[PDB]
C-alpha cells in the first residue's frame, strides 16, 4: 500500500516567498518558499499520488509580521487553503496564550490539531476539550492512519500556555494512546509532533506500534543525496531508528520556514508493517511557481501589512548576519547591533556592558540595493517584543554566565550569548566551566577607559533583555545572584530609535568573541 | 652681577588657569596657570630682585578660544600688560598669517619681538622691516643685556608665513648676529628662540658668544629636585651645554600653558662671564593668587567669548583623553572619537577606515560634574580649522604610513596615528620600517564584515583630515601614491554634529593600537 507523506515543520508565518536566508525577499527572481508555491506542488503530488497526507509539525506563529498583525488568522486560512490533513500544537502556538490560539486557530482551523501530551484541567479545561485531541483516525485510500500528536514538555518554559495547562512527557502520553489505536486496528500510525529531532528519536525507538515519526521544533534537515542549499544536513532522509521492538522506524524532518517540502513515500502490507520509505525533502523554489490565486490571496493580506513596512527607518552598509548558525556559534554582527543600541537609549534617561542570548535574534536583514531598513524587517528580527532591562551583577556571576554561555557548545544552542563592551575568549578543549580562558571587560570609572580583566569580585551593570533578567534559558545563577534590577524599554522600539538616531549602521565582527 | 631670567613658553592662548590637564578650568580651587596668576609671581620677583628679565619664548598663538576670536590681541593687550621685556617668534604667530601678526601684534607690542633667521624679501619686506629684529640690547641696572632672537627653519612646512618670507637656519644665522653683539662690547647675552630642546642644545654649543640659552616650542620641562606635578623632567634646570669655547651654557626652558614659570638666576662678572646659574620652574599653582586688576581685566574681555561657550552641544561620561602624552604614545580615546565621528558625517552624502595624526589632537576634555561638551571644549581640540577629507589608498600605502607612524617613535613626535576601522600591532624591537608586526583593517564589500590582514595590493578608502591628505609630518607617501582625492567637511563642526547626534559618548581604549 503507498502512502505519501508531505510534511512542512516550523514555518513561523513565512507564507510569504523569502530570500535564501528565509527573510524578506529582495529578488524574486532568486526567492524561494511561501504558502504560494507550496501549493503548486502539493497539488502537483495530489495530482500523481492517490495517497497522500499533508501535516505540518507545530510552529506556524510567530516569526514574521504576518503574526504579530493577525495573531492567527493567517495560519488557519491559508493552512486550510493548502488543505493540510493534520497539525501537531508547537511550542509557538501559544505566544498569544491558550485564548491566543483558540480563538484565532483552533476555532477556525477546518482539520484536527494534535497533542497527547497536553493535559487539560481547571476551569479553562471546560472547553477547550475537544478543541485538539491526542490522535485522529485519517481515511486514505481504502485503509486508515493514525496520527498521534505530541508537544515539547519544555513549552511552558518556553512560550506562554498559562496556567491552566499541564505539558506532559511525551513517550510516556503517547504510548497508551498508541496502544488504544492499535486495539483499534488502526495498523499504520505516524506520529508528528514538536519536540526536536533529538526528542523524536527517543519516541521512534521507544515507542511500540509507531510506523514513522514526523517532527520538529529545531529545525533539523535530512537530506540523502547532494542538498540543494546553504543548509549542512545531519543525516539521510529518512533517518532510520532501530527500535526495541526490531523495527526500522523512519525518523524525516524538514528545515524550517517553508523553504522545504518533506516527501516521503511508504510502502506498507496488510498488517501494516513498514517494508520501505524512500523521499527526501524538496527545496520549494523558484523554478515551482506561485499559485496564482494563492499569490493573489496572499496580497488581499499584504495590503493590511503594508502599512508597517513601507514607513521609513534608517540604512544599513553591511549585511546583518542575524543567522542562527552564527548568531548562536561565534560573533555575528547583528548581535553587535542590538547590544551597541541597547547601551545608546538608556544613556539620556552609566552602564557600557551588554549580554544578549543569540537565541533572541530569530532572522537576518540582508543589506540590498539601498540598504534600507524597516519595521517589518527589525520586526521579524525581535518577534518577542520585550524589553532592555538594566541589572546589577557580581564579576562571579557574569563569570559563570559566559561558561553557560558554551557549557553545551555545538548544538545550535540558544543560550550562546552576544556581547557589547565585552571581549570573552573561549577554548572548548576543556570541560564545561573552564571553557573561558580570558574576560576583558570595559570599565568607565576609571581614569582610562578600556577593557580590564573581569574580577570576581566586583560589581558590574550590564543591560539585557528581559528574558534574560529573569534567568531564561538556564541562566538561573542571573535570576537569582543580581544585586538590583530595574525596569527596560521596549526591545524593537528602542533600536528603532537607534538606527533611526545613526541614520547608517555597519556593525561588523569586531574580535568581541575569540575562540582559543 | 645679578640677573634673574624669567620666562615663558608655548602658552597657547591659556591665559586663563586651566584644570592641571592645561584644558578649561572646572574647580579653581585646584586650577593652576594664567596671565593673572603669572603677574602676581611676575610682581613678586621684581619686588625682591632689582635686575629682572621677562622673556616669552614663543608661541602663544592658537590653543584655545581665546585665540580664534581675537586672533592675536589678547597677546599683545596681556602679554603689555605682564610687562613682557622681549619675545622670539614662533612658529604660531603666522596661524593667521603674516598679516595675521604684524597688524594685531607686532604693531600693537610695547615691546621688541626678535628673530634672527627669518629674512623678509618682496613687495612685504617694505613694512615689516624694523615690525621685528634679530635681537635687541636692553639695559638692566646699570649694565647691558643682548638679546638674539631664532625661530623654527621648519615653519614654513609648520605654519603659514606667506611666500614672502625666508626662514634660515638659526645658528647659521645667529652667529654673526653675536659677532656684531659683542664688537659692540654686549658681553651678557642670552639666546631667545622657537626651535625645540634639541636644537637648543645646537645653539649653546656651537654659538661663540652666547651665555644662556632660553627657548621652546618642544614643550620640554626641567627640574633640579623633586617635580611638582605630572610632568616628569627631561634633565636638571638648567641643564648645562659644554660648548665648544669651554664654557658652561645654561639650557633652560619651562613647560608649557603657562603652567610653570621659569626662574634662573644668574651671576655675572665684569667681562659677563657665567660663574653660575641656580634656578627652576616655578609652578603657577593655586597658591598664588590671581592679581584682581588682571583678573578682572580677563572677565572684560571673557565676556565676549562667552557666547561660543555658553551653547550646548552634548554629552561626555568618560573622560576623553586628548593629551599628547597618550596620544602621540598609544591609544587615546579622543582620536578615537575623533575618528568615528569622522565615519558618521560622510555616511550621510561607503568608507570605514580613519587615520589621524595625534599631533592635530591638541587639548583633553575633562568629563565633569554633568559631562557636558561645547564649543569652547572642541574648538580646544582642533585649533587649525580643517576638513575631512577622502582619500583612496594602496594598501602598501597605508602599510608605510603606519611604519611611518612609529619610525622615530618616542620623542612626542606628533605624527603618531589614531586609527578607527583599522587593528595595528607594533613590535618595538624591530629597526624602523620592520616595526609594525600585524595589521587587520576593516572591510565592508565582504559578505562577513570583519577586520582582515591587509593586502598589499589591494586598494582601501580611508578618511585623514586635510593636512594629512596632503602628506603633511612626513607622510609624503600618502600626498604621492594616492589614487583619489576628495573634499572634506570642516573638522571642528562635523565632530560637533556627530557628538550633538549622539547626545553621549563614551569612546574607550578597544585595542585598536597594540603593542608586541
Ligand atoms: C525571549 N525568548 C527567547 O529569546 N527564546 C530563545 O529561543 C531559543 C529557542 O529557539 P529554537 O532553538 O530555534 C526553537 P523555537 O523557540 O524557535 O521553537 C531559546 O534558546 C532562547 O534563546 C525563547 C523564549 C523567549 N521568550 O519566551 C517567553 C515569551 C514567549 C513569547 C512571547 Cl510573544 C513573549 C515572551
Ligand atoms: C594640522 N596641523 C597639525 O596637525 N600639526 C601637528 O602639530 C605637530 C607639531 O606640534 P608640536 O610638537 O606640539 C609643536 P607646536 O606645533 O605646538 O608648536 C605636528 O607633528 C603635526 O602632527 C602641525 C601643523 C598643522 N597644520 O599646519 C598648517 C596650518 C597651520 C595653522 C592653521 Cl590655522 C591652519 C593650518
Ligand atoms: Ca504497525
Ligand atoms: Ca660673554
Ligand atoms: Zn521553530
Ligand atoms: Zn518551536
Ligand atoms: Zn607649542
Ligand atoms: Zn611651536
Excluded at 155 to 176: H, K, M, R, W, Y
Excluded at 202 to 231: C, M, W
Excluded at 236 to 258: L, M
Excluded at 412 to 424: A, K, N, R
Aim: aromatic share 8%; charged share 25%; glycine share 8%.
Amino acid at each position: 500500500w503507498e502512502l505519501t507523506i508531505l510534511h512542512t515543520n516550523d514555518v513561523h508565518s513565512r507564507l510569504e516567498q523569502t530570500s535564501e536566508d528565509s527573510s524578506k525577499c529582495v529578488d524574486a527572481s532568486r526567492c524561494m518558499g511561501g504558502v504560494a508555491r507550496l501549493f503548486t506542488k502539493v497539488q502537483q503530488i495530489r495530482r500523481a499520488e492517490p495517497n497522500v497526507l499533508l501535516l505540518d509539525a507545530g510552529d506556524q506563529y510567530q516569526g514574521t509580521i504576518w503574526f504579530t498583525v493577525y495573531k492567527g488568522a493567517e495560519v488557519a486560512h491559508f493552512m486550510n487553503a493548502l488543505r493540510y490533513d493534520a497539525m501537531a500544537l508547537g511550542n509557538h502556538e501559544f505566544d498569544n496564550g491558550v485564548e491566543g490560539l483558540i480563538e484565532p486557530l483552533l476555532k477556525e482551523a477546518k482539520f484536527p490539531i494534535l497533542s497527547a501530551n497536553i493535559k487539560a484541567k481547571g476551569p479553562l479545561a471546560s472547553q477547550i476539550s475537544g478543541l485538539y485531541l491526542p490522535y485522529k483516525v485519517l481515511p486514505v485510500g481504502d485503509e486508515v492512519v493514525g496520527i498521534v500528536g505530541y508537544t515539547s514538555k519544555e513549552t511552558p518554559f518556553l512560550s506562554n500556555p498559562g496556567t491552566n495547562l499541564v505539558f506532559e512527557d511525551e513517550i510516556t502520553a503517547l504510548q497508551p494512546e498508541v496502544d488504544k489505536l492499535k486495539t483499534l486496528n488502526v495498523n499504520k500510525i505516524i506520529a508528528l509532533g514538536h519536540s526536536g529531532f533529538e526528542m523524536d528519536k527517543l519516541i521512534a525507538q521507544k515507542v511500540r506500534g509507531v510506523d514513522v515519526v514526523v517532527g520538529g521544533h529545531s529545525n533539523t534537515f535530512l537530506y540523502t543525496g547532494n542538498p540543494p542549499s546553504k543548509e549542512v544536513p545531519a543525516g539521510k532522509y529518512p533517518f532510520i531508528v532501530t527500535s526495541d521492538d526490531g523495527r526500522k522506524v523512519p525518523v524525516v524532518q524538514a528545515y524550517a520556514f517553508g523553504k522545504y517540502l518533506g516527501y516521503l513515500k511508504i510502502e506498507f502490507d496488510e498488517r501494516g508493517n513498514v517494508i520501505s520509505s524512500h523521499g527526501n525533502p524538496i527545496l520549494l523554489d523558484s523554478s515551482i511557481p506561485e499559485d496564482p490565486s494563492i499569490k493573489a490571496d496572499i496580497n488581499k493580506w499584504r495590503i493590511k501589512l503594508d502599512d508597517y513596512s513601507t514607513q521609513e527607518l534608517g540604512k544599513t552598509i553591511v549585511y546583518l548576519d542575524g543567522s542562527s548558525q552564527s548568531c548562536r556559534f561565534r560573533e555575528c554582527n547583528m548581535g553587535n547591533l542590538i547590544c551597541d543600541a541597547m547601551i545608546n537609549n538608556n544613556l539620556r534617561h552609566h552602564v557600557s556592558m551588554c549580554i544578549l542570548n543569540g537565541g533572541g535574534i530569530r532572522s537576518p536583514i540582508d543589506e540590498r540595493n539601498d540598504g534600507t531598513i524597516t519595521w517589518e524587517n527589525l520586526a521579524a528580527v525581535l518577534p518577542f517584543g520585550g524589553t532592555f532591562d538594566l541589572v546589577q551583577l557580581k564579576g562571579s556571576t557574569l563569570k559563570k554566565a559566559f561558561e553557560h554561555s558554551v557549557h553545551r557548545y555545538g548544538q545550535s544552542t540558544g543560550e550562546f550569548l552576544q556581547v557589547g563592551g565585552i571581549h570573552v575568549v573561549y577554548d572548548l578543549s576543556r570541560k564545561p566551566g573552564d571553557r573561558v580562558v580570558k574576560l576583558d571587560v570595559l570599565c568607565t570609572k576609571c581614569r582610562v577607559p578600556s577593557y580590564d580583566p573581569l574580577k570576581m569580585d566586583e560589581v558590574y551593570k550590564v543591560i539585557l533583555p528581559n528574558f534574560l533578567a529573569n534567568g531564561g534559558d538556564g541562566f538561573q545563577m542571573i535570576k537569582d545572584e543580581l544585586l538590583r534590577h530595574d525596569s527596560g524599554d521596549q526591545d524593537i522600539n528602542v533600536v528603532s530609535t537607534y538606527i533611526s538616531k545613526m541614520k547608517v549602521i555597519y556593525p561588523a565582527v569586531e574580535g568581541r568573541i575569540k575562540f582559543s
